[PDB]
Amino acid sequence: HMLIFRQLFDQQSSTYTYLLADSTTREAVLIDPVFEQVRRDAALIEELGLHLLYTIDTHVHADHVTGAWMLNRRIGSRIAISAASGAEGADRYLSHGDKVEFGTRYLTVRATPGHTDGCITLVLDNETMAFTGDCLLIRGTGRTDFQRGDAHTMFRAVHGQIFTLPTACLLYPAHDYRGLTVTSVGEERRFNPRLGGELCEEDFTGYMTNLHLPHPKQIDVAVPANLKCGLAEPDWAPLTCSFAGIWEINAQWLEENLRAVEIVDVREPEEFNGPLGRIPAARLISLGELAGRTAELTKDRPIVTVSRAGGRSAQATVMLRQAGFERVANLPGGMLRWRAEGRVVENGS
Template identity: 75%
Template sequence: MIFRQLIDPQSSTYTYLLADSESAEAVLIDPVFEQARRDAALIEELGVHLLYTIDTHVHADHVTGAWLLKRLTGSQIAISAASGAQGADRYLDHGDRCHFGARHLAVRTTPGHTRGCISLVLDNESMAFTGDCLLIRGTGRTDFQQGDSRVMFRSIHKQLFTLPASTLLFPGHDYRGLTVTSVGEEQRFNPRLGGDLCEDDFAGFMLNLNLPHPRQIAVAVPANLKCGAAACDPTQITEPDWAVLTYTFAGIWEISPQSLEEQLAAVQIIDVREPDEYEGPLGRIPHATLIPLGDLAQRAGEIQLDRPVVTVCRAGGRSAQATTILRKAGFPAVANLAGGMLRWRAEGRIVENASP
């Protein structure tokens, strides 16, 4: 099985990709709207087919990427039947299974943080994904969105603590950078409900947390009640319109040699190799401007802001870094030539000053 744990640093939200290695069918748990392009790029690079995005509940601290990923990949949206959300393709109840190839995730309803919270247990019970119910040495809060501390205590003890002690638990969030725990660890060491702590102890603990509401709650909850379709940042939806580009999991927009050759007259080509390479046997793309990578930040003012920029190097590595430098300098339309001059020459594209 393919497994990836991803994070959105703004909301400290974990997103999980699981795929069956044989069929390449995949599911994605708790995607974040601002990270949808990243997730779609990973799915493309791994060569898997996304069947479902599954939200463990209606989030209050970020907007789900479910709707945008459906648009980008054709995946279906799944969420708890008790969530109250509209626009999903599948509504999940306790005992349902989300299949991907020969594998599946079993749904366990775990209300308490919200009325519609679910946890997802892998078929062999080696892993479980607990959303905002059980966290690492903590729990989700219970003071809004139909939260109930006593209901959460019972959910954890009946649905999660009944799993094998060795089951690895992957939470929806962690604000300290912790990534995974286990049923046995939380039964012993969770300061809110582990050991001999009872339901009254837990309820008293939760009553006195006195936490501020999440900063994005006014935007996130209405958007998530529509599975992310009401998200309000159009920059996450629109694609660059000056060329056909590909977004990579590394966070780089790339342009193919063919697409660049079609756009030569409309773009600025910045060659970030060293001067001896620029004059060397690989040659250079016509009208390319030489600015070595080490000089780029200081010489960015020599490049026009109002024309798209394509960065070039030998194989595409240094020029990928160049796109990052230029974006930080305020250039809105920047792409890296995929494969660099090696691929450009291999495809027989036009060059200047090259050896046969």
């Protein structure tokens, strides 16, 4: 049927992560995942009801540590990268012409070295979009001064693998520092200041040799970590983290261990003595008074906020975590889900 496509951006390394999936089979693939964003990217795969077949990595990154290894152990995905990168511990190595499939859709590998000798470009099956990585950026190119990088090879790879793509084809890069999101083949072929227009191989290399950039900060860490594919958490209840950021607690576990946590009920006083009941041992502290009543809460006990549907209780976690509570968890669905799952309620109807 349709393609499902999402662009995520890592503020700390300016990295674009790309999530593709086929709505027919709900099977997905995730391009250039970032280490610090693993709980975030996996949350979004669950809220979309997807299944991550592969994490693909266009090249060994110097700016950021990849999330391929962490995601392979969390949700089961498979570390793909090019064979030319040199990285150890991938489930599938990749070569020019490899068809990576997910559902009825697929991507196509194109070797585009120059940034590194392992850089690849993932073209979409219908060739409406492609993921160049660090080979070709928006009105620019990746740097050619480290990681076996050569500006002659980048120019040959852009004019021969990327500029041969259809004119209207969108080009999604792995980074951008100006707040831009996409560019087409026709734009760069014409307006790229480094190697578009009428520039020749000798015009590009004189631009790069005289482009002097500051090193990335995580270079001494990312490169050895990404050479091993990214190899170098709340343990007081079974906890997940919604894409929205809020931590949620397993209700079934909570029913079994009501004595362990400090259940806090943030509804109005009416609602607590009201028709929906209340979890046994709940503690009425209304949301509009929990700002300046935080001093009434034990540090030696995790806190689990509850409300009607679980919205005002999520806001209670942001309030408790700004007050310095390290163990806090919303109960998803609130009493409406609690009651509709048969769980024990006092003073109901």
